[PDB]
Amino acid sequence: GMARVEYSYEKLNDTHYKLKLKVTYEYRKSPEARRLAEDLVQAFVDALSSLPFITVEYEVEEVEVE
Amino acid sequence: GMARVEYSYEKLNDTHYKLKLKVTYEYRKSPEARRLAEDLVQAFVDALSSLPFITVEYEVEEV
Known part of the structure; x- marks a missing residue:
């Protein structure tokens, strides 16, 4: 399918970076791709x-098709 | 299909870091899953x- 990852991050004094990831992907109505996408995103x-x-x-944002 | 992401890291500074990743996955005969796994890896x-x-x-390693 297709996937995108955009982020926001913030840096305060003496505070480690805070990161927010927005994960969007389409699995093209394939059950194996949906299982694999969820397993891989979770692994990341x-x-x-x-x-x-x-x-x-x-x-995380799932999309059935384009 | 199942997927797995091994990881390690080391300190360069107190802000800069070096992240190592090893991604393994299977696509279960699905062309859509294979490309999606690769696009997801490229995106991250x-x-x-x-x-x-x-x-x-x-x-990245296929199994």
Whole structure:
């Protein structure tokens, strides 16, 4: 399908960067692509949240088709 | 299909960091899932690598 990731981030004094990711993707009505997209986005979520020197917030947006 | 993202990192400064990623996935015979997995990886990477406080090194493996 197709995917997009735009972000907002904020830097305050002595406070590690705060990051918000907006994840939008289309799975073209394919169940395997939907399962794989949710598993992969979640896998990226677990990797980025674990980073201790940055605060990560998420917004995921599924789209059936273009 | 299932997917997995291994990760590591190291300190460059107290603001700049180096993030390493290893993405593994399967597409379950679905062409749409395969391209979607790759577009998702490219989107995350381009977004993270555009952050001035992050440098990204990554590899992708199919299973």
